[PDB]
Design a protein around this ligand. Structure first.
Ligand SMILES: *[C@](*)(CO)CC[C@H](N)C(=O)O
Ligand SMILES: *[C@](*)(CO)CC[C@H](N)C(=O)O
Ligand SMILES: *[C@](*)(CO)CC[C@H](N)C(=O)O
Ligand SMILES: *[C@](*)(CO)CC[C@H](N)C(=O)O
Lengths: 324, 324, 324, 324
């Protein structure tokens, strides 16, 4: 059987509540990895699993420095001959962030599968058990290699570069409206549909094994009456980059333009993304800053942080955004 | 023929570029209302149209004080016996904000139909002509009365309370994933599907007659490493409310919590929404602030501003968010 | 507490397999209603539940004669003062057909909620328990009255007229792409979003309490090289109506039109629907037969079958399709 | 500039009506290929184009004998040094059938791009011009090679294997809900997202040179009370295969089982697909026939016909369905 390491970080999949009817406001990251494994013994028929407790927190508290350590640990594990793949339990709220980070930094073709759950382990009809089982099946399948980092949940396999939490509270929240899923798992069988046409993992230039932190990047929203002072505040607090979750295709108000101008004069890299949820923010030489291609705000921040560890050249960073 | 006033505010539907191939980075709010009307002569067959130039700007620059004037002007028009409905041309980027504002403040059952276009009027296969014709048809149909403010584009009729721009650059960007459309227009016939189960227009308590300004409300994003200083900044500039485009179901990091506690101490109303794009942010007594129900950040800000013109009582405001 | 009757008919929600990993090819309608109730005792805190075993079969074998009896029993149940609502367990495959039949034939405003499950009761992360809890919650809520027949599953409430199984094997299969959900259930709370703008239940003319059989209506597919002989066969077997799951907007090939014309000449009523999955089949005076509005083939057959119990008048039947 | 041949077959993109408001019931395949090119001269700045009138029909009348000739002509064309790609104008109703057929029979990596329109050329805001321009850009782009046959419309690039017409009459009808788009076209730039993970074109074993017709395959629908006599009829007319657009995951009623057994006894290959619209029909040893993987009925019929040109062995045909 394939040797799979289940690296636990917390989340609802490891969460609990006083009753089985409480599906919200529960405590995330309360249960240990072995408890998750023991809850679904069937996994042992899919692989020889080993649980490792990396952390146990609600993902809203996951930070770049910790995500950095997570990627470095996964790289250490994948370098071992006795490890064929890694399943990472993580809270749903920022899994797209953590997953995309490793998508760009893991130097291996071995499967790296993030798994999550929208209902706590104690809930009636909890989704975590089946999602974990599916994650291990995907991580241990020889056909899962070289596909980039994946996020498995609700019978779907999504690419870390496209998948995002689209709904605040539903089981089927993870979707990539325009890009679809890399594959699906039905009747204990994996059906691979797509291979992402972007750079990742073994073909990524982003290596952070020699770093302990990443350049600071904040996200500012775009909306009617958006304030200039928020740009002032970000600049003053030392951001290296600003991701703009803009109105429409990264459109900017006169106040947003003034704020971006100030940011650029201070050497801050401005990246225009969109608040809409999907789609392409196209180049526009008439507006300040760079454009995020199809990366949403959360994803754009991650790539910009990594881009900044390599260069400050806007043209190079822009190309990264069209290829990663 | 019904008497329909076409109130123009600008946008891509009135946008232009030097060539028919340029569909991005064009000049929004460039053409006059009579030019749009004459571009689609067919509207004159569906109604007695009167064009009125309210403004002509790109919607990223639409501001609350101007939206306020727009609502009062529309209210004024619909009180006239010689006006059966109004069609408001508006840029796509913030039409959901302006539309929901009128949805809550226009005290009339007569149709109020926002219309927009994703391609400039000069573009090959421009969508504005048909969108406008559809809008006029909807505004003039007596079966269109008492449905709340609507947004018409790409053969669909969306409720101001549910519809949102979900894609940065596509023609089919306006969708209400979980709520669907109020109706669709195919083959010059309107097919009404749903009636929104929420308070609006004639049943709304949000009277804004005579007002000239609105309570200041800003939006802060939720993501890994989100900074506390952004909350400090908002408070320092006297916001009356803060809408949080949070991770997942409005989950908050330890930094976000500290920032929210500070805001509450200063009497600022905190409203937790979601950055995901869809869904319910449920009540959670363990977290600070109020919850946005299914309102996304842009819509939540609008309702909060209007709520604050009547009260600062969190319980009353929260009820508004579950009923409007 | 409301008095809710759980009327069981079978399905995967009452399905069972030898292993917890077998989610496909299991035995549907294997467990009794009381076993379902005692398995999710939490329902007892939401209402006073009484189980009744109407049948126990796989929905692919549900027949019109039996659905007729189900409708009649439900009418009997709801006429009682000691019954506040009914939850009907049913297999997912044809629940949209049974649900829409009762949607048209139940003469009561009391809630009628069909519930189902995509994973057998014996599977890991089975969805049936939560779905049932949600269905009872909906059936017993005073706010649920007069909304038409509903289908509850995966935290969603769909109208029988719009909801359809859109995916062969996923938990989130039930959706109404263009019409959205009537409401959702999150955190043990119901959020009603829409009220269907169509005739149903207490406003329907489709009373069939005095019937034991229904007009025969078959469905024929539209595709390249579709054969004329299938129409000849249906006619020869006494069909009173033919529903065409046509290419695009009910478009017809030279062979299909010949088939339809033979059917019309033979006294059969022809209804042109679509195989696409969504949308409007508009009127077309150059094509034979009636058009299905936005009803898909499965729904179209149900309405046509019921229409035929009242009339053979094309114009009357057509108006039914635009109003129900 | 690249050399692109625009091979016209008809459709709404070549449709015409007396007025610009008539977008339904128009005459498809009424305009010549050169008329389409002259209406969008911008294409000539993207490539050296040559129009070729293969046919001018409504796609509901496209037949296998003709599709065979279309595939053979495209192979002939792409074998030429002076042809960099081919754009095929085709009606929307069966473009998914014709496109998937060529996807399996064209032995070249040069771009094969089907294009269509949902509004006639004479319609207000006709989509045909932009759709064609985008199709030409995709067909002439070096990055477009080796991606399988594509269908371009409404700024989206869909794979012939996944794309399908999901709505009867909307501009955004073409979607692959679970698989997404191969790419999108925004601001005159192509953004490639995925590469399908299936066999096609140059790696396909389906050699159809010399063939003038294909094995007969008909499609029968699954629904409550589905008739056994339709299977008898199909058998009587000598079908070599039957694609079942089944209830749910290809579930079969007692009548369907009886009819399938009769067909199997007669040597007919029975393929179980789904009427739902999306998803996997998983293998089930308890049911008759083969399963269609994620192929919908229309796509399944095409692959089954081609499968039968090589073998009647069920095991082999099943593998084709899991790999193409
Ligand atoms: C449960 C749903 O995933 C709550 C998740 C936490 N907020 C987390 O992100 O860990
Ligand atoms: C054209 C697409 O709507 C650009 C719109 C402007 N940004 C606006 O919102 O007015
Ligand atoms: C399990 C998924 O619902 C199988 C359902 C049966 N085919 C049925 O419809 O009862
Ligand atoms: C116009 C929309 O595509 C009508 C299409 C024809 N039915 C066709 O398929 O050619």
């Amino acid at each position: 059987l394939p040797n799979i390491v289940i690296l636990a970080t917390g989340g609802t999949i490891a969460g609990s509540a006083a009753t089985g009817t409480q599906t919200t406001g529960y405590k995330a990251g309360a249960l240990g990895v072995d408890t998750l494994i023991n809850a679904v013994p069937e996994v042992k028929k899919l692989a020889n699993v080993k649980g490792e407790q990396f952390s146990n927190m609600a993902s809203e508290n996951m930070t770049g420095d910790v995500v950095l350590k997570l990627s470095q640990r996964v790289n250490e594990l994948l370098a071992r001959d006795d490890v064929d793949g890694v399943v990472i339990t993580h809270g749903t709220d920022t899994v797209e962030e953590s997953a995309y980070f490793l998508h760009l930094t893991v130097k291996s073709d071995k499967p790296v599968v993030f798994v999550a759950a929208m209902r706590p382990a104690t809930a009636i009809s909890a989704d975590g058990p089946m999602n974990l089982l599916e994650a291990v099946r995907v991580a241990g399948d020889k056909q899962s290699r070289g596909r980039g980092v994946m996020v498995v949940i609700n019978d779907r396999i999504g690419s870390a570069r496209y998948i995002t939490k689209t709904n605040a509270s539903t089981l089927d929240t993870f979707r990539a409206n325009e890009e679809g899923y890399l594959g699906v798992i039905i009747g204990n069988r994996i059906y691979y549909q797509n291979r992402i046409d972007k750079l990742h993992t073994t073909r990524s230039v982003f290596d952070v094994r020699g770093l302990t932190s990443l350049p600071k990047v904040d996200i500012l929203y775009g909306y009617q009456d958006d304030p200039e002072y928020l740009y002032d505040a970000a600049i003053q607090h030392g951001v290296k980059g600003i991701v703009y979750a803009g109105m429409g295709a990264g459109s900017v108000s006169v106040r947003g333009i003034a704020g971006m101008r100030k940011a650029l004069e201070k050497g801050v890299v401005v990246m225009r993304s969109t608040r809409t949820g999907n789609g392409i923010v196209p180049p526009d030489e008439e507006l300040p800053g760079l454009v995020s291609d199809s990366l949403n705000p959360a994803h754009a921040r991650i790539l910009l942080m990594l881009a900044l560890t390599r260069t400050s050249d806007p043209k190079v960073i822009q190309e990264y955004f069209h290829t990663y």
